[model samples]
Target: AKTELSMGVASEDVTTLDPHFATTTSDRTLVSYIYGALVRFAPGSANPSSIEADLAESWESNADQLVWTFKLRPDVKWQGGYGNVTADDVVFSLDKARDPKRSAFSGDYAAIQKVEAVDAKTVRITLTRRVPSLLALLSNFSGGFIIPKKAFKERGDDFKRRPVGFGPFQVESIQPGQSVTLTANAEYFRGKPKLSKISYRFLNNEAARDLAFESGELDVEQGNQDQRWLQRLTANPENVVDTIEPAELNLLHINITKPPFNDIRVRQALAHTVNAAQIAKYRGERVNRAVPSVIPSNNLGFDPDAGVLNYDPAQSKKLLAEAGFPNGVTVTMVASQLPGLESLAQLIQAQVAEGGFTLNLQPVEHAAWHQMIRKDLSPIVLYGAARFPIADYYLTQFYHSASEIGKPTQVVNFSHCNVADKQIEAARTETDPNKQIELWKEAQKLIVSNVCAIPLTENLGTWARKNKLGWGFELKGSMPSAPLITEQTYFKD
Candidate 1:
């Protein structure tokens, strides 16, 4: 049993294991263990700077930084008697990632002009223009994960539930609404995994997952974001609470399609009224802090001078009255029952009340909440997300006009904002670093002044594990859904 580990995550079920379509944290977490990309983030780190070769041993780019070539590390065996990893597989996988029909993250790979097999060990890529970070996009996360071409073709849609990849572990079974079991890949390109098995569980509620972890039924468990709850976990000598970054930014996307919000004054009132400071304090200022810009502060091209509106209750009330709502106005919105955000919502409702803004909170189940928001049913959407740690990744998806919800190529632009469309698009192909920063900075200023979304507080990735296990690397930052369990990860009792 020491050769195996069990974990409890907060999910009722998984959405899909196909990395191309993986949007939810459930699929993202589980799929990571089984897939390998050309490059990978260092264990226990999310910083793109920590990327190293996974499938490819070496790679190089041309003078313009547009054409790139990679030498695949050979003999990497795929799961289920599949052949070794090859150039065709790399080309096949990346092409799928860029196709909108097969990938939810197709927008992220728009710059990829072509990806093809040069030889059995070589792969080449040509970019349409300069991108912020090409290597980071090819690292082992989200759309970067490699898929075996033959296996997927034979499996068809069944591959979504049961995928075969060339990573350290392989999915053995998936029990709907209950859990998943994965076993070590004996022919794993690195070395056989130290931990032979992983029991990935779905414990939907907070108390149930905590109780299981307390009773020694789980080796590590996904943790609640509340500081007080984590404090209790840290009090136990047997537990180590892993706090990883970069913190996911929580933002309030104001739906301008609705009345009142259509007026800039009402949107500004929404921005001025909500107290980001109090929200962070309530959520634990140490692990959580208010972010001003739409993109994360740690990302490249983030200009600190691109300011957010100061928190002013008096200013908020004035704006509301100026928008013809002297007695305050009620706006209905959907709130997810996913514990952390639900708690944050209650705090936001209280803080905004002081500005004569009434938030009519309609509670929805987590899965249903995702569905409702995409339907454009909510007047205000509270979304927290982390992308590739680049300004363009965040800017393009959430601020670009094409990404507006309900649009043909809709992404997560819940605000229906187009104020920075020109700037966002221009910054994409801007070759010079300083000039690119200026464009991104100016874009943020435009978005902030227009009050499309309220930049709120953020919380880093959280997990609590037994002291006897080893991640094989020091914790710093990690993928937000969960920190990955690598080939070197071990367990001892």
Candidate 2:
């Protein structure tokens, strides 16, 4: 019998099939099946040091670190046997990725001076300056996957719905809001995949996903954050529950550019009012941890012993009074409709109320909430995200002033806080690995002390799978999603 895996995704729908434009986790999960990158993270490892070759066989860089040359594998061929991948595709993809109008991560690629093909199988990328975290930004799972130029030339914007790459699977059909079906690529350069097909079903409702898993409609599903729910799933010996760390940071971004939050004392007041322990309790202890800083425990630069914002309503009240809001101030906060966040927002609302402040919580559709917050309309934003393996990606994206959404840099800095921008820049420019890590740690410490963003809970994800399924390797953490099914996963007879 042909093996097939049925998985459930918590998203309402995939954002896009185009790798450059796809930002949601569901899109990434599907993209990973069809695309191949120059380099990739080792399966089941989230560490930066775990980077390995994917499409490119090996690579070398100049002594100054300003230039990198990749040697591609001659055997790698595009989907539908278009042709073996060449330097032209790499050059086109890199250029396309850096175009601000087309790619979401243009800033990350902005440092590249140019990418040129030395020959059919050789490509060289030159940078204006050395960036230590460059490889990570280009890693297969991140933003560095190479796209087929022929496919893009033929399809243009329509490629967003249909993409072609040299991976282990090919898209068979796409059902908007329903499922994405994929079949094995027998001619995959790595090796023939054991599984014959994969069906990714969209089930945004937690109850629906749980019921589907219970009914055996889904071979794998993401377990909820509740301990009781996890226990029930684990009680069945036929199910395996997987939890991985440094998965996400559930935090609040205080817009320093806005009134009330503009006052450092008020910002600190909000920080001191947040009870990390209380918040983590709502999500099961097994799936969440109270962290002192936005940098989670499993990642580097996290100081376990560092002082965090204390849960002190009295002190919070005093701080507000000191900041000329003795009667408390009202601020609007937007919460995403995703699971657990609306409830978390309400929990924070009650906690801040005890501190003598009015938190007017607005529950909006997740897409609308994202738009509102990205426009910098919210005074406070309760957001959750999975950071890349490197600390710089997190620091630059969320803290650096250059990354402010509407700014020319066009990144996702929600707070518009510049308290640690210099430190973030210093860390980004540092070439030494050890020194860069230390610099990032210092920067995070400063960001925490300033209360620019308050870290609430460190999210640990859980996925339940049937015992009959055998992933060739142990599961590892991904940037934004769970159950990263690759070609190596299979079902046992």
Candidate 3:
């Protein structure tokens, strides 16, 4: 029997279907419906913890790390009339990444020169430098995965609207901001999906989604929940609750270069006022601890012994007085629609006020908020970033100071620290995994002490599913650390 599965996603528009360029959460939600990466983290994970091979059957790297060879499975085919996927598709996808205007992600794969097709079944990739994480990065949803050449080539401008792939579902119909329908792909490489169709409906309020899920109109739903809801739902055996670790590292960014914040004394003072342990305790079931380093506590480079910022309003006052602000100063705090941030912001606002800093509230749409951060127009931002599948990719992309300069896609380094270019070079040269780990540890610490950005919590992921739904969805490794794989799951009837 064919099953009908319904899920809920909080999105304004599902128009951003081009996975390469789709950076917003709403757009990413759509990409998960109709796309497949070479590898993906299991559903509900923030990081790509485990390896789930999607397109490539398997791959290997040489000792020198100059070449990477991948074996393509013969069964993978595009839903929109493209024949079996082959080595050429892989080559085309990599080439597209390298195209200057075509994709900004290709810069992340800067080592690759070209992908060589040895035959219909085999593909070889030559690199300009040694990249240990190439395999994992290639499987990433952003720049990896072979898009159907036919669909992209034919529809030049409207590709985002009409995307095609070899995933478990195919795009049926799309009405922009209203909804997007995805029907199960008949020729899916992993056999047919149990669910006949899945639709991502955009709703404005959390109440609407909650009511719909309770009324049996929706199968999966998500929203901020209190202890009362969990207690109520758990009492009823008919409902199932799953708490996913978010990959977002909730943070408090201080403009070290700006007034009041420029003084390390005031910065240290503000840090001491907020109780990391208390914040983590009430952050609900899915929240992790407040880590000191930039990366999560479990990632390859994370340091367990890294010291955390503590609560000490007295010390905060002392530092404020030292900074010459004996009384108090006012500043505005901006937040988008990000979950758990406003409350966190409010907590900081109240706590810091006692130490002579007044934090005002300035809320905007998530899109506009990101633009402000990129332009460096905002003084401080409480933001999050996905943990790149590999440690190196994560560093070079956003956290690295060298990559911060002249970055068109990402600017105003969230930490706002200017790291030397050689640090990037040293990171690139450290091939030994242990050595690489040490180098990253130092890098993360340096960013921390500079007071550019404060690590608040581990990456968190939250998903909602109804009872009686049967599908083999497992949270693989690191996805809790980085939620980069939305293209790897299929429903089992």
TM-score of model 2 vs. true structure: 0.94
For candidate 3, lDDT tens digit of each residue in 66-163?
A: 88888878878788888888777777778886664677465677778878889987889998887757766676456765686667889867887888
TM-score of model 1 relative to the true fold?
0.97
Which prediction has the highest lDDT against the true structure? Answer: 1
Q: Candidate 3's error at 367, in angstroms?
A: 3.0
Clashes (backbone N, CA, C under 3 Å), per candidate, total: 1, 1, 22
| Model 2 lDDT tens row, 1-493 | 4399999977777667787776666787788788878888776766668788888889998888888999989999888667889999999988988877878777778679999999999989999876756677678764687898888999897787777889888888889889989888888887888999999898878889999998899998876567877888989888988886446777888888788888889988888887889877876787887887766676655566545788888998999999998899898777787766776787788888888779997778675677788787788888777767567777777888887868767666788867777777777668877887778878888778877888888677778898889877887665544655567878988
**Tell me, what's the RMSD of every candidate?**
1.5, 2.0, 3.3
lDDT head-to-head 1 vs 3, winner: 1
1-493 per-residue lDDT for model 1 (tens digits): 3888899998878778999887667678888888989998988788887899899999999989899999999878899898889999999999999987788778888889999899999999999988778997899887899998898899998999889999888999999889999999988878989999999999979899999999999998988678987898999999999887878888999887778799999999888888887787877976888887887878788867777888898999898889898999898879987777788888889999988888888988776788789889898999888888879988888888888888767778999989998888888888888998889999999988888888988788789999998887887876754878878889765
Candidate 3 lDDT at 175 equals 74
Candidate 3's error at 205, in angstroms?
A: 2.1
Question: Model 1 segments beyond 4 Å from truth?
Answer: none
